[PDB]
Every structure is written in structure tokens, then in C-alpha cells.
Scaffold this active site. Structure first.
Site, short mmCIF file in Angstrom:
data_model
loop_
_atom_site.label_atom_id
_atom_site.label_comp_id
_atom_site.label_asym_id
_atom_site.label_seq_id
_atom_site.Cartn_x
_atom_site.Cartn_y
_atom_site.Cartn_z
N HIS A 1 -64.24 -4.65 7.72
CA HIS A 1 -65.36 -4.16 8.50
C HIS A 1 -65.00 -3.99 9.98
CE1 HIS A 1 -65.90 -8.55 9.33
NE2 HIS A 1 -66.34 -8.09 10.50
N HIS B 1 -62.32 -2.27 16.45
CA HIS B 1 -61.17 -2.63 15.63
C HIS B 1 -61.56 -3.13 14.25
CE1 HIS B 1 -62.51 -6.58 16.99
NE2 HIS B 1 -61.85 -7.07 15.96
#
Length: 206
Positions: free
Chosen positions: A60, A139
Site C-alpha cells: 500500500h 512511497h
């Protein structure tokens, strides 16, 4: 109450693609001549073992840590219209690079303008988020050292992006792109072609 955090959660297929690319990078970087010279700048080495702590399920990209409304700016983020409208919607995340540090291994996400609207801007912003555009922190965590927390991955990225702002030449060529040695145990793989992963924006509960 609010979720633990909001973010983009990759599909099972996209997760598997990015994850397998991540491990291949760890195997490659570990076998590489350039990396074995600077090991003293990394460890006082199988990196896949070193980054033992990995996401157990799907990968995720976090937008905002809320901790059920305990975190600062959690309520202000969730009350946004764009967050409500985007809740459950599908998105595509651009992966521009894979990176490694003594603390974390991750993947840099280059957010689109639409997706940047889902990025928060709270009062507290760490030092490394100085002369860099918002969302630079975006990220996907691929792995962490034993005593490191996943949240550190974002800080590692921002620290890395501050270095490159000053510019560097590559020290090697991996199959997916050029390898850059940024010193102090930091490494970045600039992918020749950016990976696109599919993900859904929503909220994760503990």
C-alpha cells in the site's frame, strides 16, 4: 471514528508484481560489485534476509496516518470532499525508482495531480521535506530492518531526494535501470520505464 490510515492499496496482481520486483532488486544489489565495496558504510550479505520485516499481505501507499483520530490533522483530512469522493475509487500509481538504506527498502511513487489532491499538508512536516515538492514522500514499503518501523521508509526517501536535488553518475547497470550510490548506505535504482500499479483508495482499520 477514523481509520488507522488512508491510502492506496494495490490489487493482488499489482502487489505481486511490485513485490517480486523488489526482491529481485535486493538479490541483484547484494550480488553487485559496487555494493560489496561499501558494506562498511551499510553494516558494521543477503539483503532479503536483512530486510526481514515485510508487508504480510498486499502492498500500500499511505496518504495520511490517522490512528482513529488520535493523530494530528486526522479529522481535517477525512472531512475533505476529495477524500470522500475518492473513497473506494481506483487509481494508478507510477513507480519511478526502487531504493535501499540501512533501515528500509521501498519504492518511490510519483503522484499525479489528481492523486496529489489526496495528499495531506498538516502542521508537522519533518526537516527533510524542505525544498522538495509536496508528495515527494509518497512511497510503498517493501521491507525494513529488524528494529525499524515502516513509517521510516518515507523519511528515508525524503532524505534520499534531498541528496539528488544537489544534482550524479551511475555506478552500475541493473536490468531495469541504472544504479546510483548516494553514500552512507543509500542506493537508488532509476527504472528505465516506470512501473504502473493499480490500487484502490480507502481506509485501513486495525
Amino acid at each position: 471514528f477514523l481509520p488507522l490510515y488512508f491510502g492506496w492499496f494495490l490489487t493482488k496482481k499489482s502487489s505481486e508484481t511490485l513485490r517480486k520486483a523488489g526482491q529481485v532488486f535486493l538479490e541483484e544489489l547484494g550480488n553487485h560489485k559496487a555494493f560489496k565495496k561499501e558494506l562498511r558504510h551499510f553494516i558494521s550479505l543477503e539483503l532479503v534476509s536483512y530486510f526481514g520485516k515485510r508487508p504480510p499481505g498486499v502492498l500500500h501507499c499511505t496518504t495520511k496516518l490517522c490512528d482513529y483520530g488520535k493523530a494530528a490533522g486526522a479529522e481535517e483530512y477525512a472531512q475533505q470532499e476529495v477524500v470522500k469522493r475518492s473513497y473506494g475509487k481506483a487509481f494508478k500509481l507510477s513507480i519511478s525508482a526502487l531504493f535501499v538504506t540501512p533501515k528500509t527498502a521501498g519504492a518511490q511513487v510519483v503522484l499525479t495531480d489528481q492523486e496529489l489532491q489526496l495528499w495531506p499538508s498538516d502542521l508537522d512536516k519533518p526537516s527533510a521535506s524542505e525544498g522538495l515538492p509536496p508528495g515527494s514522500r509518497a512511497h510503498v514499503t517493501l521491507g525494513c530492518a529488524a528494529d525499524v518501523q515502516p513509517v521510516q521508509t518515507g523519511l528515508d526517501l525524503l532524505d534520499i531526494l534531498q541528496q539528488v536535488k544537489g544534482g550524479g553518475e551511475a555506478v552500475g547497470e541493473l536490468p531495469r535501470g541504472k544504479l546510483y550510490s548516494l553514500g552512507k548506505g543509500r542506493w537508488m535504482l532509476s527504472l528505465t520505464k516506470k512501473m504502473e500499479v493499480k490500487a484502490i483508495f480507502t481506509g485501513y482499520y486495525g
